[PDB]
Amino acid sequence: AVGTIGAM
Amino acid sequence: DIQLTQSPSFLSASVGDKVTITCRASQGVRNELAWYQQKPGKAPNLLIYYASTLQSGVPSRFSATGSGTHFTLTVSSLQPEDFATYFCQHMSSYPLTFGGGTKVEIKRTVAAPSVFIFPPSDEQLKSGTASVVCLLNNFYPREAKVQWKVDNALQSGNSQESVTEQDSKDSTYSLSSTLTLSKADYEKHKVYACEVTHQGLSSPVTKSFNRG
Amino acid sequence: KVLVQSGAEVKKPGASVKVSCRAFGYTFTGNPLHWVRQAPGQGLEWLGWINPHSGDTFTSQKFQGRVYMTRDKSINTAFLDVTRLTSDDTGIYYCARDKYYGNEAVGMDVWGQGTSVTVSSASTKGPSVFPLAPTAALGCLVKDYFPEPVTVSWNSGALTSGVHTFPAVLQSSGLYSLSSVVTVPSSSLGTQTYICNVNHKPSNTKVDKKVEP
């Protein structure tokens, strides 16, 4: 799925 | 974009019924889909994610499945708390998109509206405007059609309606219609009628008052 | 755990609004925050989401250049700026946390109570209250007020059973108007005194209309 704003 | 179609949009069912909602995706969204439940006045609540995994705290009667473009949500036996509007959502590409929603309503026995008419208040009439209010109280199902007659003349001009949500205890609906005129127009006539049409009325009911 | 949003807002067309959203009970910088809005009576519309740790954002394409997501980590608060408002932006604005399992969108876990945003040219107007005198049904007419909301209550909260307060309707004047009604025993209308209360908080207007036959 969408997850372009990064990892956390 | 990428649209989600929910079917049906409105659904009536009584407590204890097994019911199934359908979400169809314009494009393939492999497994990346969520289901929400929203009651009037609240923020939505998460029920299902990964198309089929229950969110913590969701009763086991809720379940969902779905592959690519066809998804379904099911309640094994409806409960008073389950009656709300349900949204699907995908997260496979931008923008995230919700379905149009499915409103699930309590099915109950047909009940006819109790009709009441209220002539304008003297304080309002002194202000230059006259509002005549017709109230349809505790009826089911949800269409009710109201027709206004000033001096027996059909008033397809300006009047407003307002419907409550389904009652928590009765599962009925209530409706208020408001006919608005000037002081000079209100005082130029005499009769004011309110004709109510509903499934629970074999013949439409008329409620009128004189003076004004 | 909990997302707390700022209070309702009333703005004129072409103005800007700043909604805020504070996080409690979890690490603010551990989950993306979505922004979703709902027009009166309608479905949900996604505005974008923000990485609170980095401040990185993706804004929904329809709103790019008009909507701005920011955050203040020192107070666990996220901000949403909606500029150049028109009537198409009237509705409730929610912030929602994503579970974000696998570093990837999964589902909106925690929602705020929502922030109401009304875009209109109308000016603040106190309501006029008129009695709706007569199995016995009476009521109050709350007419020509702006903005929402108004609270009714009957006999200061004691009378609550057969009460129906209707959703306000927006007239062409840009003003709101609603009715609150009650069904009472076919006759108690000589002993019992029925008073509807009306609180229009944006106008500092409280009115207790006695509904007598």
Tab-separated table of C-alpha atoms in Angstrom:
chain	number	residue	atom	x	y	z
A	1	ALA	CA	0.000	0.000	0.000
A	2	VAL	CA	0.849	3.700	-0.025
A	3	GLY	CA	3.649	4.761	2.320
A	4	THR	CA	5.638	7.530	0.644
A	5	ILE	CA	5.718	9.805	3.730
A	6	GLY	CA	8.467	7.619	5.155
A	7	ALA	CA	9.085	4.977	7.792
A	8	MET	CA	8.501	5.146	11.544
B	1	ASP	CA	-8.408	8.850	-8.738
B	2	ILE	CA	-9.896	5.411	-8.094
B	3	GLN	CA	-13.521	5.129	-7.017
B	4	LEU	CA	-15.261	2.675	-4.685
B	5	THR	CA	-18.932	1.864	-5.243
B	6	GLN	CA	-20.934	0.627	-2.257
B	7	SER	CA	-24.069	-1.418	-2.767
B	8	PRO	CA	-26.739	-0.941	-1.590
B	9	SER	CA	-26.701	2.683	-0.415
B	10	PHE	CA	-29.704	2.275	1.899
B	11	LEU	CA	-30.651	-0.926	3.680
B	12	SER	CA	-33.497	-1.699	6.051
B	13	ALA	CA	-33.224	-4.740	8.291
B	14	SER	CA	-34.473	-5.694	11.718
B	15	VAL	CA	-32.474	-6.732	14.755
B	16	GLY	CA	-31.072	-10.242	14.495
B	17	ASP	CA	-30.876	-10.256	10.695
B	18	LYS	CA	-27.787	-11.415	8.820
B	19	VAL	CA	-26.796	-8.683	6.362
B	20	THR	CA	-24.045	-8.258	3.761
B	21	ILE	CA	-22.609	-5.018	2.343
B	22	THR	CA	-20.676	-4.885	-0.929
B	23	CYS	CA	-17.801	-2.609	-1.955
B	24	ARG	CA	-16.659	-2.691	-5.588
B	25	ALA	CA	-13.383	-1.021	-6.587
B	26	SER	CA	-12.893	0.660	-9.973
B	27	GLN	CA	-9.379	-0.861	-9.998
B	28	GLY	CA	-7.499	-3.680	-8.340
B	29	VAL	CA	-6.686	-2.971	-4.694
B	30	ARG	CA	-5.082	-6.232	-3.601
B	31	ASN	CA	-6.175	-6.671	0.046
B	32	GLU	CA	-5.435	-3.011	0.966
B	33	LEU	CA	-8.947	-2.073	2.063
B	34	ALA	CA	-10.616	-1.008	5.317
B	35	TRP	CA	-14.195	-0.841	6.615
B	36	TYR	CA	-15.557	1.850	8.935
B	37	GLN	CA	-18.755	2.352	10.916
B	38	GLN	CA	-20.092	5.852	11.598
B	39	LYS	CA	-23.156	6.727	13.683
B	40	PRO	CA	-24.678	10.202	13.294
B	41	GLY	CA	-22.775	12.762	15.332
B	42	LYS	CA	-19.541	10.731	15.612
B	43	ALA	CA	-16.243	10.276	13.884
B	44	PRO	CA	-15.974	6.966	11.995
B	45	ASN	CA	-14.755	3.842	13.799
B	46	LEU	CA	-12.418	1.256	12.288
B	47	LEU	CA	-13.864	-2.260	11.939
B	48	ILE	CA	-11.805	-4.144	9.346
B	49	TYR	CA	-8.367	-3.735	7.809
B	50	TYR	CA	-6.398	-5.864	5.345
B	51	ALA	CA	-9.863	-6.499	3.846
B	52	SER	CA	-10.610	-9.134	6.496
B	53	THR	CA	-8.777	-8.576	9.804
B	54	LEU	CA	-10.928	-7.380	12.674
B	55	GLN	CA	-9.722	-4.359	14.573
B	56	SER	CA	-9.219	-4.906	18.304
B	57	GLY	CA	-12.496	-4.639	20.206
B	58	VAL	CA	-14.749	-5.402	17.224
B	59	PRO	CA	-17.375	-8.046	18.112
B	60	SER	CA	-16.991	-11.394	16.372
B	61	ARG	CA	-20.317	-10.983	14.560
B	62	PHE	CA	-18.462	-8.648	12.187
B	63	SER	CA	-16.522	-10.286	9.366
B	64	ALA	CA	-15.326	-9.302	5.904
B	65	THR	CA	-13.705	-10.773	2.815
B	66	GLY	CA	-12.644	-9.548	-0.589
B	67	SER	CA	-10.247	-10.018	-3.493
B	68	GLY	CA	-8.890	-7.276	-5.729
B	69	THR	CA	-12.036	-5.419	-6.804
B	70	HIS	CA	-14.927	-7.139	-4.964
B	71	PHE	CA	-15.217	-6.811	-1.176
B	72	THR	CA	-18.021	-7.673	1.260
B	73	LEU	CA	-18.713	-6.964	4.930
B	74	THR	CA	-21.132	-9.118	6.925
B	75	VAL	CA	-22.854	-9.002	10.311
B	76	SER	CA	-24.118	-12.419	11.405
B	77	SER	CA	-26.895	-10.977	13.580
B	78	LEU	CA	-27.559	-7.243	13.691
B	79	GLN	CA	-27.775	-5.451	17.034
B	80	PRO	CA	-29.084	-2.000	18.006
B	81	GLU	CA	-25.495	-0.728	18.104
B	82	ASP	CA	-24.732	-2.000	14.592
B	83	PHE	CA	-27.251	0.366	12.951
B	84	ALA	CA	-25.168	3.134	11.381
B	85	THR	CA	-23.471	4.059	8.098
B	86	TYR	CA	-20.583	1.945	6.800
B	87	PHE	CA	-17.726	3.130	4.564
B	88	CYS	CA	-15.066	1.217	2.714
B	89	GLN	CA	-11.663	2.776	2.103
B	90	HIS	CA	-8.688	1.771	-0.017
B	91	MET	CA	-5.076	2.823	0.454
B	92	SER	CA	-3.481	1.397	-2.680
B	93	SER	CA	-2.582	4.724	-4.326
B	94	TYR	CA	-3.072	8.434	-3.897
B	95	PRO	CA	-5.572	9.812	-3.163
B	96	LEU	CA	-7.092	7.574	-0.502
B	97	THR	CA	-10.750	7.146	-1.382
B	98	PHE	CA	-13.847	6.161	0.576
B	99	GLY	CA	-16.968	4.490	-0.705
B	100	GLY	CA	-20.208	6.439	-0.863
B	101	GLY	CA	-21.483	4.696	2.250
B	102	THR	CA	-24.238	2.261	3.202
B	103	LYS	CA	-26.827	3.411	5.746
B	104	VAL	CA	-28.268	0.473	7.685
B	105	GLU	CA	-31.642	1.276	9.231
B	106	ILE	CA	-33.830	-0.599	11.723
B	107	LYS	CA	-36.800	-2.319	10.103
B	108	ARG	CA	-39.927	-2.120	12.274
B	109	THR	CA	-43.681	-2.366	11.801
B	110	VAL	CA	-45.444	0.284	9.731
B	111	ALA	CA	-46.527	3.175	11.957
B	112	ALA	CA	-48.593	6.135	10.838
B	113	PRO	CA	-47.646	9.726	11.681
B	114	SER	CA	-49.531	11.700	14.297
B	115	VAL	CA	-50.188	15.081	12.683
B	116	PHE	CA	-50.351	18.437	14.478
B	117	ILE	CA	-50.618	21.964	13.078
B	118	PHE	CA	-49.436	25.107	14.883
B	119	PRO	CA	-50.698	28.566	13.863
B	120	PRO	CA	-48.110	31.366	14.051
B	121	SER	CA	-47.322	33.062	17.337
B	122	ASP	CA	-48.607	36.566	17.985
B	123	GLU	CA	-45.051	37.678	18.789
B	124	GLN	CA	-43.909	36.429	15.380
B	125	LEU	CA	-46.910	37.937	13.583
B	126	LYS	CA	-46.025	41.257	15.239
B	127	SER	CA	-42.540	40.900	13.695
B	128	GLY	CA	-43.965	40.852	10.143
B	129	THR	CA	-43.623	37.158	9.240
B	130	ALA	CA	-45.865	34.155	9.827
B	131	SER	CA	-44.653	30.555	10.076
B	132	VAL	CA	-47.189	27.724	10.035
B	133	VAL	CA	-45.716	24.473	11.344
B	134	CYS	CA	-46.976	20.974	10.592
B	135	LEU	CA	-45.532	18.139	12.666
B	136	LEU	CA	-45.574	14.448	11.722
B	137	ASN	CA	-44.688	12.512	14.859
B	138	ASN	CA	-43.285	8.981	15.262
B	139	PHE	CA	-43.949	7.248	11.949
B	140	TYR	CA	-42.336	4.492	9.880
B	141	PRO	CA	-41.097	4.057	7.125
B	142	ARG	CA	-39.265	7.169	6.068
B	143	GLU	CA	-41.124	8.786	3.112
B	144	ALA	CA	-43.745	11.137	4.280
B	145	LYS	CA	-45.021	13.684	1.766
B	146	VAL	CA	-46.645	16.886	3.051
B	147	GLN	CA	-48.821	19.252	1.011
B	148	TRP	CA	-49.851	22.754	2.072
B	149	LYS	CA	-53.193	24.379	1.253
B	150	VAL	CA	-53.704	27.998	2.218
B	151	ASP	CA	-57.274	28.779	1.132
B	152	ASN	CA	-57.673	25.320	-0.394
B	153	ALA	CA	-55.068	26.400	-2.978
B	154	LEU	CA	-52.095	24.064	-3.421
B	155	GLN	CA	-49.021	25.871	-2.142
B	156	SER	CA	-46.178	24.617	-4.332
B	157	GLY	CA	-44.187	27.696	-3.355
B	158	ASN	CA	-41.810	27.976	-0.391
B	159	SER	CA	-41.954	25.610	2.589
B	160	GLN	CA	-39.262	23.610	4.370
B	161	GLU	CA	-39.013	20.102	5.798
B	162	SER	CA	-36.744	18.601	8.442
B	163	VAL	CA	-36.523	14.938	9.471
B	164	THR	CA	-35.030	13.527	12.639
B	165	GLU	CA	-32.847	10.459	12.662
B	166	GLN	CA	-34.377	7.110	13.543
B	167	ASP	CA	-35.352	7.043	17.211
B	168	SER	CA	-33.201	4.902	19.500
B	169	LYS	CA	-36.238	3.376	21.265
B	170	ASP	CA	-39.127	3.605	18.766
B	171	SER	CA	-37.142	3.200	15.532
B	172	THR	CA	-39.600	5.755	14.117
B	173	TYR	CA	-39.099	9.074	12.333
B	174	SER	CA	-40.405	12.574	12.930
B	175	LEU	CA	-40.908	15.421	10.474
B	176	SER	CA	-41.655	19.141	10.714
B	177	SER	CA	-42.801	21.241	7.756
B	178	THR	CA	-42.728	25.041	7.948
B	179	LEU	CA	-44.774	27.293	5.658
B	180	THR	CA	-43.584	30.908	5.759
B	181	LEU	CA	-45.594	33.946	4.650
B	182	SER	CA	-45.771	37.661	5.330
B	183	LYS	CA	-48.088	39.241	7.874
B	184	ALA	CA	-50.164	40.721	5.052
B	185	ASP	CA	-50.372	37.380	3.254
B	186	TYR	CA	-51.216	35.418	6.404
B	187	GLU	CA	-53.990	37.847	7.369
B	188	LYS	CA	-55.454	37.882	3.830
B	189	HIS	CA	-56.589	34.236	4.136
B	190	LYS	CA	-58.428	32.138	6.706
B	191	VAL	CA	-57.953	28.383	6.309
B	192	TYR	CA	-54.555	26.712	6.581
B	193	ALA	CA	-54.352	22.983	5.879
B	194	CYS	CA	-51.659	20.297	6.019
B	195	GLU	CA	-52.202	17.141	3.949
B	196	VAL	CA	-50.029	14.184	4.981
B	197	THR	CA	-49.325	11.125	2.813
B	198	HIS	CA	-47.745	8.003	4.296
B	199	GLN	CA	-47.684	4.220	3.987
B	200	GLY	CA	-49.569	3.969	7.289
B	201	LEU	CA	-52.486	6.097	6.029
B	202	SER	CA	-55.003	4.360	3.770
B	203	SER	CA	-56.201	7.872	2.896
B	204	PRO	CA	-54.070	10.999	3.415
B	205	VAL	CA	-54.968	12.849	6.590
B	206	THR	CA	-55.777	16.595	6.661
B	207	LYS	CA	-55.181	18.943	9.590
B	208	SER	CA	-56.369	22.531	9.358
B	209	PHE	CA	-57.011	25.629	11.408
B	210	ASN	CA	-59.067	28.782	10.891
B	211	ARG	CA	-58.432	32.505	11.587
B	212	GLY	CA	-55.367	34.510	10.612
C	1	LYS	CA	-5.539	6.476	22.602
C	2	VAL	CA	-7.082	9.966	22.078
C	3	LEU	CA	-6.962	12.792	19.512
C	4	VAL	CA	-8.307	16.181	20.660
C	5	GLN	CA	-9.280	18.777	18.039
C	6	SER	CA	-9.827	22.525	18.283
C	7	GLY	CA	-13.222	24.194	18.449
C	8	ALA	CA	-15.700	25.029	15.714
C	9	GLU	CA	-14.835	27.792	13.247
C	10	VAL	CA	-16.922	30.241	11.205
C	11	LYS	CA	-15.235	31.968	8.271
C	12	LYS	CA	-16.186	34.255	5.389
C	13	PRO	CA	-15.565	33.179	1.774
C	14	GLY	CA	-11.946	33.608	0.732
C	15	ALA	CA	-10.650	33.439	4.309
C	16	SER	CA	-8.391	30.821	5.911
C	17	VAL	CA	-8.872	28.480	8.866
C	18	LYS	CA	-6.307	26.704	11.052
C	19	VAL	CA	-7.553	23.525	12.733
C	20	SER	CA	-5.359	21.866	15.357
C	21	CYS	CA	-5.186	18.286	16.604
C	22	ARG	CA	-3.305	17.067	19.690
C	23	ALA	CA	-2.350	13.453	20.413
C	24	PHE	CA	-2.592	11.666	23.775
C	25	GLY	CA	-1.729	8.180	24.952
C	26	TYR	CA	0.710	7.241	22.192
C	27	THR	CA	3.946	8.453	20.636
C	28	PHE	CA	2.973	11.377	18.413
C	29	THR	CA	5.965	10.743	16.124
C	30	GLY	CA	5.211	7.030	15.678
C	31	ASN	CA	2.225	7.179	13.307
C	32	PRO	CA	1.102	9.235	10.301
C	33	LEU	CA	-1.868	11.545	10.756
C	34	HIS	CA	-4.562	11.721	8.093
C	35	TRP	CA	-6.909	14.633	7.524
C	36	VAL	CA	-10.439	13.790	6.355
C	37	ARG	CA	-13.454	16.049	5.962
C	38	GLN	CA	-17.191	15.455	5.650
C	39	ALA	CA	-19.699	17.888	4.171
C	40	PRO	CA	-23.105	18.118	5.917
C	41	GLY	CA	-24.873	14.920	4.982
C	42	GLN	CA	-22.214	13.594	2.760
C	43	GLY	CA	-19.417	11.032	2.614
C	44	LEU	CA	-15.749	11.281	3.524
C	45	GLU	CA	-13.021	13.040	1.536
C	46	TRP	CA	-9.297	12.496	2.104
C	47	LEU	CA	-7.155	15.632	2.259
C	48	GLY	CA	-3.674	14.211	2.841
C	49	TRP	CA	-1.452	12.853	5.572
C	50	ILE	CA	1.688	13.949	7.409
C	51	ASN	CA	4.744	12.274	8.922
C	52	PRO	CA	4.822	14.075	12.298
C	53	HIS	CA	8.449	13.123	12.970
C	54	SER	CA	9.870	14.559	9.736
C	55	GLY	CA	7.076	16.959	8.770
C	56	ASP	CA	6.919	15.332	5.328
C	57	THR	CA	3.501	15.431	3.705
C	58	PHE	CA	1.509	14.283	0.756
C	59	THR	CA	-1.481	16.522	0.106
C	60	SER	CA	-4.360	15.207	-1.960
C	61	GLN	CA	-4.006	16.456	-5.516
C	62	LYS	CA	-7.376	18.246	-5.537
C	63	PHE	CA	-6.180	20.435	-2.635
C	64	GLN	CA	-2.494	20.963	-3.489
C	65	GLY	CA	-1.455	24.578	-3.032
C	66	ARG	CA	-4.572	25.304	-0.940
C	67	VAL	CA	-4.254	22.980	2.083
C	68	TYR	CA	-1.194	22.790	4.341
C	69	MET	CA	-0.313	20.182	6.969
C	70	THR	CA	2.205	21.122	9.667
C	71	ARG	CA	2.991	20.002	13.200
C	72	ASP	CA	4.543	21.156	16.476
C	73	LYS	CA	6.223	18.161	18.123
C	74	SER	CA	6.890	19.945	21.419
C	75	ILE	CA	3.149	19.820	22.186
C	76	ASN	CA	2.162	16.744	20.142
C	77	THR	CA	-0.098	18.913	17.970
C	78	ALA	CA	-0.785	18.689	14.237
C	79	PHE	CA	-2.121	21.599	12.185
C	80	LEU	CA	-4.273	21.833	9.065
C	81	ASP	CA	-4.447	25.098	7.113
C	82	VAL	CA	-7.281	25.426	4.602
C	83	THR	CA	-6.997	28.634	2.596
C	84	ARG	CA	-9.227	30.463	0.113
C	85	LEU	CA	-12.366	28.935	1.594
C	86	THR	CA	-15.610	28.633	-0.341
C	87	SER	CA	-18.948	27.101	0.602
C	88	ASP	CA	-17.682	23.783	-0.801
C	89	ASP	CA	-15.404	23.549	2.259
C	90	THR	CA	-18.184	23.702	4.865
C	91	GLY	CA	-18.203	20.527	6.929
C	92	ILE	CA	-16.513	18.632	9.733
C	93	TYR	CA	-12.734	18.131	9.623
C	94	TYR	CA	-11.217	15.056	11.293
C	95	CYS	CA	-7.655	14.094	12.082
C	96	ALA	CA	-7.015	10.362	12.200
C	97	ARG	CA	-4.026	8.243	13.162
C	98	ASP	CA	-2.959	5.367	10.921
C	99	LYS	CA	-1.872	2.023	12.367
C	100	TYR	CA	0.865	2.011	9.694
C	101	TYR	CA	1.885	-1.624	10.126
C	102	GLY	CA	4.785	-2.482	7.850
C	103	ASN	CA	5.597	1.216	7.301
C	104	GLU	CA	2.594	1.477	5.036
C	105	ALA	CA	-1.015	2.674	5.146
C	106	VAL	CA	-3.335	0.186	6.847
C	107	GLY	CA	-6.323	1.944	8.385
C	108	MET	CA	-7.417	4.963	10.412
C	109	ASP	CA	-7.079	3.811	14.018
C	110	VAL	CA	-7.871	6.819	16.218
C	111	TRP	CA	-10.058	9.763	15.251
C	112	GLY	CA	-10.558	13.184	16.736
C	113	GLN	CA	-13.972	14.457	17.737
C	114	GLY	CA	-13.969	16.588	14.581
C	115	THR	CA	-13.889	20.334	13.945
C	116	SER	CA	-16.834	22.073	12.313
C	117	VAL	CA	-15.983	24.687	9.679
C	118	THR	CA	-18.762	26.908	8.323
C	119	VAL	CA	-18.004	29.086	5.291
C	120	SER	CA	-20.668	31.747	4.814
C	121	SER	CA	-21.248	35.466	4.337
C	122	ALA	CA	-23.895	35.515	7.088
C	123	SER	CA	-23.286	37.623	10.189
C	124	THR	CA	-23.732	36.428	13.762
C	125	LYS	CA	-27.460	36.582	14.563
C	126	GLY	CA	-29.261	35.659	17.763
C	127	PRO	CA	-32.321	33.445	17.362
C	128	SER	CA	-35.925	34.507	17.806
C	129	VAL	CA	-37.916	32.037	19.920
C	130	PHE	CA	-41.651	31.641	19.370
C	131	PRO	CA	-44.034	29.339	21.260
C	132	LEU	CA	-45.756	26.551	19.354
C	133	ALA	CA	-48.849	26.347	21.529
C	134	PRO	CA	-51.382	23.471	20.947
C	135	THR	CA	-52.608	13.603	22.734
C	136	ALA	CA	-51.153	17.076	23.460
C	137	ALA	CA	-48.103	18.278	21.502
C	138	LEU	CA	-46.345	21.633	21.944
C	139	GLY	CA	-42.997	23.100	21.006
C	140	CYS	CA	-40.621	26.000	20.461
C	141	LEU	CA	-39.624	27.670	17.192
C	142	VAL	CA	-35.992	28.811	17.021
C	143	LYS	CA	-35.799	31.015	13.933
C	144	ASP	CA	-33.293	33.152	12.008
C	145	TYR	CA	-29.989	32.520	13.757
C	146	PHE	CA	-26.378	32.161	12.666
C	147	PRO	CA	-24.140	30.278	13.105
C	148	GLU	CA	-24.812	26.775	14.348
C	149	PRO	CA	-25.434	25.377	16.875
C	150	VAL	CA	-28.234	25.992	19.352
C	151	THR	CA	-29.109	23.831	22.341
C	152	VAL	CA	-32.708	23.483	23.471
C	153	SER	CA	-33.599	21.335	26.508
C	154	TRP	CA	-37.037	21.498	28.153
C	155	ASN	CA	-37.743	22.513	31.758
C	156	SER	CA	-33.985	22.851	32.367
C	157	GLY	CA	-33.341	19.194	31.523
C	158	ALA	CA	-36.054	17.438	33.538
C	159	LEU	CA	-38.441	16.899	30.605
C	160	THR	CA	-36.712	14.557	28.156
C	161	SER	CA	-38.989	11.718	26.981
C	162	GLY	CA	-41.159	12.621	24.000
C	163	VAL	CA	-38.827	15.415	22.898
C	164	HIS	CA	-37.843	15.845	19.244
C	165	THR	CA	-35.410	18.638	18.358
C	166	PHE	CA	-35.161	18.823	14.582
C	167	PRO	CA	-32.016	19.414	12.524
C	168	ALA	CA	-31.724	23.075	11.617
C	169	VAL	CA	-32.554	24.122	8.058
C	170	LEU	CA	-30.590	26.753	6.147
C	171	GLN	CA	-32.859	29.317	4.513
C	172	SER	CA	-32.045	31.569	1.550
C	173	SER	CA	-31.241	34.466	3.904
C	174	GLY	CA	-28.176	32.455	4.975
C	175	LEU	CA	-29.748	32.012	8.422
C	176	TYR	CA	-30.707	28.848	10.272
C	177	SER	CA	-34.011	27.912	11.860
C	178	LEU	CA	-35.295	24.814	13.661
C	179	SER	CA	-38.118	23.543	15.869
C	180	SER	CA	-38.168	21.567	19.112
C	181	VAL	CA	-41.398	19.766	20.008
C	182	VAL	CA	-42.688	17.563	22.809
C	183	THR	CA	-45.698	15.288	23.290
C	184	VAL	CA	-47.174	15.592	26.777
C	185	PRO	CA	-50.137	13.923	28.529
C	186	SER	CA	-53.377	14.799	26.703
C	187	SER	CA	-54.025	17.219	29.538
C	188	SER	CA	-51.469	18.429	32.023
C	189	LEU	CA	-51.472	21.873	30.328
C	190	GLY	CA	-53.053	23.740	33.263
C	191	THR	CA	-50.988	22.428	36.150
C	192	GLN	CA	-47.608	21.741	34.524
C	193	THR	CA	-45.542	24.656	33.207
C	194	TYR	CA	-43.542	23.893	30.057
C	195	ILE	CA	-40.508	26.077	29.347
C	196	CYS	CA	-38.106	25.487	26.473
C	197	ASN	CA	-34.601	26.819	27.008
C	198	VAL	CA	-32.553	28.126	24.085
C	199	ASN	CA	-28.792	28.651	24.209
C	200	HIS	CA	-27.189	30.199	21.119
C	201	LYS	CA	-23.752	30.299	22.409
C	202	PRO	CA	-22.022	32.342	19.604
C	203	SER	CA	-24.419	35.212	20.326
C	204	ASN	CA	-24.595	34.995	24.147
C	205	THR	CA	-28.337	34.478	23.789
C	206	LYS	CA	-30.259	32.468	26.370
C	207	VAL	CA	-34.061	32.537	26.200
C	208	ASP	CA	-36.657	30.659	28.258
C	209	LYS	CA	-39.964	30.764	26.381
C	210	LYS	CA	-42.946	29.677	28.474
C	211	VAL	CA	-45.318	27.664	26.263
C	212	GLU	CA	-48.861	28.292	27.563
C	213	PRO	CA	-52.195	27.370	25.875
